[PDB]
Amino acid sequence: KNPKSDKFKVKRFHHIEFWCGDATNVARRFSWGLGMRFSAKSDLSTGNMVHASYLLTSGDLRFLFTAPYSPSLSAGEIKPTTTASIPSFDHGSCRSFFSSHGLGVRAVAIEVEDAESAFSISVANGAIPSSPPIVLNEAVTIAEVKLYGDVVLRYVSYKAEFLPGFERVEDASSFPLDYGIRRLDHAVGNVPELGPALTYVAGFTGFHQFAEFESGLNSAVLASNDEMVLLPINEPVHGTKRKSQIQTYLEHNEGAGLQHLALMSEDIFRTLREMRKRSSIGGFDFMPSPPPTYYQNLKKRVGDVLSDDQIKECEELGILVDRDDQGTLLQIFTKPLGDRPTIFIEIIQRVGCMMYQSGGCGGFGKGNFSELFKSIEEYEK
Amino acid sequence: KNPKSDKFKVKRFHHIEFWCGDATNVARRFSWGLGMRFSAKSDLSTGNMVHASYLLTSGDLRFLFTAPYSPSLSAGEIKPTTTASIPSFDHGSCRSFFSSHGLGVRAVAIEVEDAESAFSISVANGAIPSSPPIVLNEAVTIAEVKLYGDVVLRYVSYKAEFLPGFERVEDASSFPLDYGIRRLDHAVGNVPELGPALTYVAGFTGFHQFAEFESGLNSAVLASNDEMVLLPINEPVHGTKRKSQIQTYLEHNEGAGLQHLALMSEDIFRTLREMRKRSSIGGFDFMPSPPPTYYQNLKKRVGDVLSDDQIKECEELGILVDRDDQGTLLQIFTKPLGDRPTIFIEIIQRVGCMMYQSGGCGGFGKGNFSELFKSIEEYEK
Ligand SMILES: COc1ccc(-n2c(=O)c3c(C)c(C(=O)C4=C(O)CCCC4=O)ccc3n2C)cc1
Ligand SMILES: COc1ccc(-n2c(=O)c3c(C)c(C(=O)C4=C(O)CCCC4=O)ccc3n2C)cc1
Ligand SMILES: [Co+2]
Ligand SMILES: [Co+2]
C-alpha cells in the first residue's frame, strides 16, 4: 500500500556529506577503500577561505567530505561576502559536531524540484529549520531541515557541476578507480525513540511506511512516492541478554545519528573481492563471515535464484542473503568506518522486481538476523 | 665544533605522535602512503576508554596516531583509575589542539636513560613542564616538556613492546608493507622568532648548534652529543617579494608548530617509486619536479658521486641533491599531509661520512634553494 503522499516532488538521493577534522585524509582512505574517484574540490586553491570540501563519486554515488579551516582566515568576511561554497557551513557547528560525534554523516541530501518550496512546505509541516533556502550563482538552491540528532536533511534543486564554486579536479590527481559501487540505496538512523522520530519525519515529508515482511532493534522505513529514497530508522529494545547494538551506538555517538549507509553495487562479487583485497592496506574491514552451516541452509531457502557457483562465491566473500516475496537481496557489512563503534557501510545487490527495478526490492535483510543466529547454533552442533 | 654538552643522556628519536580527530582514517592513509605496517594498538578493544591510539612502524620509524573518544565513556574514572595508556593525554588539550592546528604533530619523543632525571634537569634549566614523569607498569617512564607552540618534547626511558597497555596487532590486519623508509632523520619547527626559541631549547637540553655551510627563512639546528637527534628551527624573513612560506605556515597553523618530518630511506629510489605509484590512489603527492636545467647543472656539481644512471634516475623521481664538504644528500618533499598548508614530509638519503654514518652527513640541503632558483631561470632562458 503506497499512498504516494509526498508533500513535495522528491527525485533521488543526491549526496551524503561527512563532517571530519581533516577532509584530505578521510577522503583518500575512502577513495581507496571503496573505489571512488576524486571528482571536485572547494578549498584554498579554489578561493574558499572557510572550509575544505572534497567530493568522491562512484556511478551516481556522491560522498562529500568537509572540514573547517582556521576561523582566522575568514574573520573579515561576513555572510554576504563569504567564500564558503556551502553557505550552510559554520565553524562552530562543525567543530562541535565532530568533537561530539567523531567522524559521521552531517547531511543526507536529496534532489527535489524546488528547494525553496520543499523547505517552506517542510517547516510549515513541523520541520525544525536548519539553514534557510539560499540560491547559488542563480542556478542551484540549497536548504536544510533537521532530521534526527545533529543530522540534517538537505534539499537541493537545479534550474537546469556538483555545486557552484566547486572545481573539477586535475586529470592527474583523478585516478579512475571503480569497484562496482553505483548508487546509494538507503541511509539509516538510530534514535532513542522510534515513534516520535517516525511521526516527526513522516509529518513534514509525507513519506509513507514501507512494507515489511528478537534481537536489539525495532525499526521502520519511510519512503518517497517511487520508493527510491528510503530512510529506515531504528530504536533499541532493552532488557535482553545481548545488549542492543543500537544503544551501544547512542552511547558512543553521544545521541542519535546516522548508523549505516547502504550502497548498491552492479556486481557485488567484484565489489567485495576488490574491497577485501584492500582491507589491510588502507581500505575497510568486514564483519566476520557467518558459519558454513549458514551456507548449508541457503540451498533450501534460495535454491531457485542462486546457483551454487554464484552461491559458493558468497561463501568466499561472506555475503549474506535474504529474500522477500517479490525479490532477493545480497548484503554485507563493514566494520565501523572510524574510531568509534558507530557508523558503518553496507554493500548490497538487489535482484528481482523488474518492470527498471523498484525500490526496496527484497527488503532490508532483517530475517538475516534470526537466520544468522540459527546458523551459529547449528554450526556449534 | 661539537662541545657535547647534553645535560642528560639522550639516545635516539623514539616516536612521533600525531593528534587527529579520527586516528583510524589518518593511520590507514599514512600506512598505505608511506609503506608503514600496523604494529600496536590501544583503544576500546584493549580496555582504553579514553583515547584511540594506533602505531605504524617502518624500520626504526614509529608514527603514533591518537584521537579522543567521547568523555562520557570515562567520566567515572579519575587520574589514578584511568584506562588511558598515555597518561599525559587529556580530552580538552587534544580537542583544542586539533581545532586550533588541524592535523599535526603533538609530541616529538626521544629515548633517554632516565626520563625522570631528564624531566627534572630540563625544568631546572628553564623547560616549561607539560606532564610530570609517570612510571608505567614499573617498566617505562614518560615525561613531557614544552618545545615550541603546542608541540612537546617527550622523554621516554625503559628499565629493560611500544608502551604498557598497548597490544600487538593481529597478523591478519597487519600487512607487511615496506617502501624502504628506515628511521626519522630530523624534525623541524617553525617559530615566530628563532632567537628565543633557540635560546630556550638549547638551554634546557644542552644541545649545541650544528655546523652550517635569500628566500624566506633563517634557521639553525640543535643537535645532541652524537648528532643523531637533530632539531632544526626556522623563522620567517619578511619584506621580500615572494612571501615567506614560514609566515604562511604560522598563519594557517595558528602559531608555531612542527613544519616537516624528514625520514631516511635505505634506497630512496625504491621509496620514491613506490610512494609515487600511490599518490593518486590514497597516498601522498609531491612537490612539483624542478626543471631539466637543474639536472643539467648537476653533473658539474656532483659528478664525482652520482653516476648518470643513478643521476637520470633522480630525474625520473624529481629528487633534489645537495652536498656539504663531508657528504652528499638526496631529498624530496611531499605536498602538505592534510587540509592546511602546514606539515609535510621529506624523504632523504645520506651518502658519506662513514666510520656507521655520522648524523647530518650532507647537511639539510639549504643550498638547494638557490640552486633551484637558478635552474628555474636557466630553463626559462
Ligand atoms: C557477525 O556478527 C554480526 C553479523 C551481522 C549483524 N547484522 C547487522 O548489523 C544487520 C543490519 C544493520 C541490517 C540492516 O541493513 C538494517 C536493519 O537491521 C534495520 C532496518 C533496515 C536496515 O537497513 C540487516 C541485517 C543485519 N545483520 C545480520 C550483527 C552481528
Ligand atoms: C617546486 O617549488 C619548491 C620546491 C622546493 C622548496 N624547498 C623546500 O621547501 C625545502 C626545505 C623545507 C629544506 C629543509 O629540509 C629544511 C630547511 O629549509 C631548513 C633547515 C633544515 C631543513 O630541514 C631544504 C631544501 C628545500 N627546497 C628546495 C620550495 C619550493
Ligand atoms: Co541496510
Ligand atoms: Co629537512
Side-chain angles (χ1 to χ4, degrees), chain A residues 2-8 10-158 160 162-169 171-212 215-240 243-295 297-298 301-309 311-315 317-325 327-365 367-370 372 375 379, chain B residues 2-8 10-158 160 162-169 171-212 215-240 243-295 297-298 301-309 311-315 317-325 327-365 367-370 372 375 379:
Chain A
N2 174 0
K4 323 203 170 180
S5 46
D6 278 4
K7 306 177 141 95
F8 44 82
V10 175
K11 294 162 94 184
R12 256 140 201 79
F13 279 134
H14 191 266
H15 65 277
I16 292 304
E17 182 177 11
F18 282 86
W19 271 5
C20 350
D22 185 82
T24 294
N25 277 265
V26 186
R28 275 165 190 252
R29 193 271 185 120
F30 274 59
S31 177
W32 176 235
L34 295 140
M36 310 190 63
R37 186 172 208 191
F38 263 83
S39 158
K41 69 180 176 171
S42 191
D43 63 3
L44 287 166
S45 73
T46 72
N48 189 340
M49 300 292 119
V50 168
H51 64 254
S53 281
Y54 305 108
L55 183 72
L56 309 187
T57 52
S58 189
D60 290 349
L61 185 50
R62 285 184 201 96
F63 273 3
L64 189 61
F65 304 85
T66 300
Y69 293 122
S70 176
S72 42
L73 300 195
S74 70
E77 311 170 353
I78 55 166
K79 266 194 163 285
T81 67
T82 189
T83 58
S85 55
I86 303 174
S88 59
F89 184 87
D90 183 72
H91 292 265
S93 305
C94 185
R95 291 196 155 81
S96 182
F97 180 99
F98 183 93
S99 92
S100 168
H101 310 301
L103 175 72
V105 168
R106 166 60 169 183
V108 183
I110 59 176
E111 190 182 344
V112 296
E113 292 201 290
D114 203 332
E116 184 161 332
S117 176
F119 174 94
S120 296
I121 293 150
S122 281
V123 310
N125 277 279
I128 315 286
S130 192
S131 150
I134 296 125
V135 188
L136 300 175
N137 177 49
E138 330 163 46
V140 194
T141 86
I142 288 122
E144 293 178 16
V145 292
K146 301 180 162 198
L147 186 63
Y148 41 61
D150 297 326
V151 179
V152 301
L153 184 63
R154 170 178 290 152
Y155 304 137
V156 185
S157 84
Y158 299 94
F162 179 61
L163 295 180
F166 272 81
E167 304 198 350
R168 249 24 158 160
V169 331
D171 356 279
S173 37
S174 196
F175 195 94
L177 295 158
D178 180 8
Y179 312 158
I181 289 161
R182 278 308 172 270
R183 84 186 171 84
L184 177 70
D185 184 81
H186 50 277
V188 169
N190 288 345
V191 307
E193 295 168 291
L194 175 57
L198 269 201
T199 299
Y200 165 73
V201 183
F204 79 77
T205 62
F207 291 162
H208 64 273
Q209 171 134 6
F210 187 90
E212 214 89 79
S215 64
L217 313 62
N218 261 345
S219 79
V221 185
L222 307 185
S224 62
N225 282 356
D226 58 12
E227 320 194 343
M228 276 311 50
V229 164
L230 308 144
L231 287 177
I233 302 174
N234 316 319
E235 70 173 8
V237 152
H238 302 120
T240 152
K243 158 163 133 213
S244 202
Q245 82 251 31
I246 310 303
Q247 181 75 33
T248 285
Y249 181 98
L250 296 170
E251 301 176 350
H252 287 258
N253 192 66
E254 284 188 23
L258 190 146
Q259 176 212 41
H260 71 276
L261 300 159
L263 329 170
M264 207 171 60
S265 174
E266 61 174 26
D267 173 11
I268 190 177
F269 296 111
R270 169 164 136 277
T271 302
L272 260 288
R273 284 192 302 268
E274 305 274 306
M275 294 190 70
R276 275 190 189 269
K277 283 209 269 235
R278 303 167 164 80
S279 284
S280 295
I281 56 166
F284 298 101
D285 298 350
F286 287 92
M287 253 354 160
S289 295
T293 166
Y294 175 90
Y295 290 91
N297 314 333
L298 283 183
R301 315 145 41 223
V302 200
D304 49 32
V305 172
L306 263 61
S307 101
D308 28 76
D309 215 293
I311 291 214
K312 234 217 133 151
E313 219 307 301
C314 294
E315 225 206 24
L317 312 180
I319 293 178
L320 271 64
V321 172
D322 208 334
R323 103 145 33 181
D324 240 0
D325 55 354
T328 171
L329 148 90
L330 313 159
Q331 54 174 191
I332 189 172
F333 303 104
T334 77
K335 282 193 230 152
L337 317 186
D339 293 331
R340 322 183 169 195
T342 53
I343 180 167
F344 57 95
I345 279 175
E346 179 188 3
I347 315 296
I348 64 154
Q349 183 150 43
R350 293 184 186 286
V351 62
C353 329
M354 306 305 300
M355 322 266 141
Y356 73 96
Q357 190 175 232
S358 66
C361 171
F364 302 91
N368 255 335
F369 280 99
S370 174
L372 176 93
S375 277
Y379 144 99
Chain B
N2 174 0
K4 323 203 170 180
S5 46
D6 278 4
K7 306 177 141 95
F8 44 82
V10 175
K11 294 162 94 184
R12 256 140 201 79
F13 279 134
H14 191 266
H15 65 277
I16 292 304
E17 182 177 11
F18 282 86
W19 271 5
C20 350
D22 185 82
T24 294
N25 277 265
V26 186
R28 275 165 190 252
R29 193 271 185 120
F30 274 59
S31 177
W32 176 235
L34 295 140
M36 310 190 63
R37 186 172 208 191
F38 263 83
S39 158
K41 69 180 176 171
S42 191
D43 63 3
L44 287 166
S45 73
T46 72
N48 189 340
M49 300 292 119
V50 168
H51 64 254
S53 281
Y54 305 108
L55 183 72
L56 309 187
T57 52
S58 189
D60 290 349
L61 185 50
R62 285 184 201 96
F63 273 3
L64 189 61
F65 304 85
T66 300
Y69 293 122
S70 176
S72 42
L73 300 195
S74 70
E77 311 170 353
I78 55 166
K79 266 194 163 285
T81 67
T82 189
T83 58
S85 55
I86 303 174
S88 59
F89 184 87
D90 183 72
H91 292 265
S93 305
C94 185
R95 291 196 155 81
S96 182
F97 180 99
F98 183 93
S99 92
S100 168
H101 310 301
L103 175 72
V105 168
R106 166 60 169 183
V108 183
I110 59 176
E111 190 182 344
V112 296
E113 292 201 290
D114 203 332
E116 184 161 332
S117 176
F119 174 94
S120 296
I121 293 150
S122 281
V123 310
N125 277 279
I128 315 286
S130 192
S131 150
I134 296 125
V135 188
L136 300 175
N137 177 49
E138 330 163 46
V140 194
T141 86
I142 288 122
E144 293 178 16
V145 292
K146 301 180 162 198
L147 186 63
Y148 41 61
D150 297 326
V151 179
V152 301
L153 184 63
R154 170 178 290 152
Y155 304 137
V156 185
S157 84
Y158 299 94
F162 179 61
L163 295 180
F166 272 81
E167 304 198 350
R168 249 24 158 160
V169 331
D171 356 279
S173 37
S174 196
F175 195 94
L177 295 158
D178 180 8
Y179 312 158
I181 289 161
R182 278 308 172 270
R183 84 186 171 84
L184 177 70
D185 184 81
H186 50 277
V188 169
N190 288 345
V191 307
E193 295 168 291
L194 175 57
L198 269 201
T199 299
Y200 165 73
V201 183
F204 79 77
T205 62
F207 291 162
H208 64 273
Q209 171 134 6
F210 187 90
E212 214 89 79
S215 64
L217 313 62
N218 261 345
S219 79
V221 185
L222 307 185
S224 62
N225 282 356
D226 58 12
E227 320 194 343
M228 276 311 50
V229 164
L230 308 144
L231 287 177
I233 302 174
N234 316 319
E235 70 173 8
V237 152
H238 302 120
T240 152
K243 158 163 133 213
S244 202
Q245 82 251 31
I246 310 303
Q247 181 75 33
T248 285
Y249 181 98
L250 296 170
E251 301 176 350
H252 287 258
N253 192 66
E254 284 188 23
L258 190 146
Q259 176 212 41
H260 71 276
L261 300 159
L263 329 170
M264 207 171 60
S265 174
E266 61 174 26
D267 173 11
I268 190 177
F269 296 111
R270 169 164 136 277
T271 302
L272 260 288
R273 284 192 302 268
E274 305 274 306
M275 294 190 70
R276 275 190 189 269
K277 283 209 269 235
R278 303 167 164 80
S279 284
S280 295
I281 56 166
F284 298 101
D285 298 350
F286 287 92
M287 253 354 160
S289 295
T293 166
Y294 175 90
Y295 290 91
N297 314 333
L298 283 183
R301 315 145 41 223
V302 200
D304 49 32
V305 172
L306 263 61
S307 101
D308 28 76
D309 215 293
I311 291 214
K312 234 217 133 151
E313 219 307 301
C314 294
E315 225 206 24
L317 312 180
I319 293 178
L320 271 64
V321 172
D322 208 334
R323 103 145 33 181
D324 240 0
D325 55 354
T328 171
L329 148 90
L330 313 159
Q331 54 174 191
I332 189 172
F333 303 104
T334 77
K335 282 193 230 152
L337 317 186
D339 293 331
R340 322 183 169 195
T342 53
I343 180 167
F344 57 95
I345 279 175
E346 179 188 3
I347 315 296
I348 64 154
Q349 183 150 43
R350 293 184 186 286
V351 62
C353 329
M354 306 305 300
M355 322 266 141
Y356 73 96
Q357 190 175 232
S358 66
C361 171
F364 302 91
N368 255 335
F369 280 99
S370 174
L372 176 93
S375 277
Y379 144 99

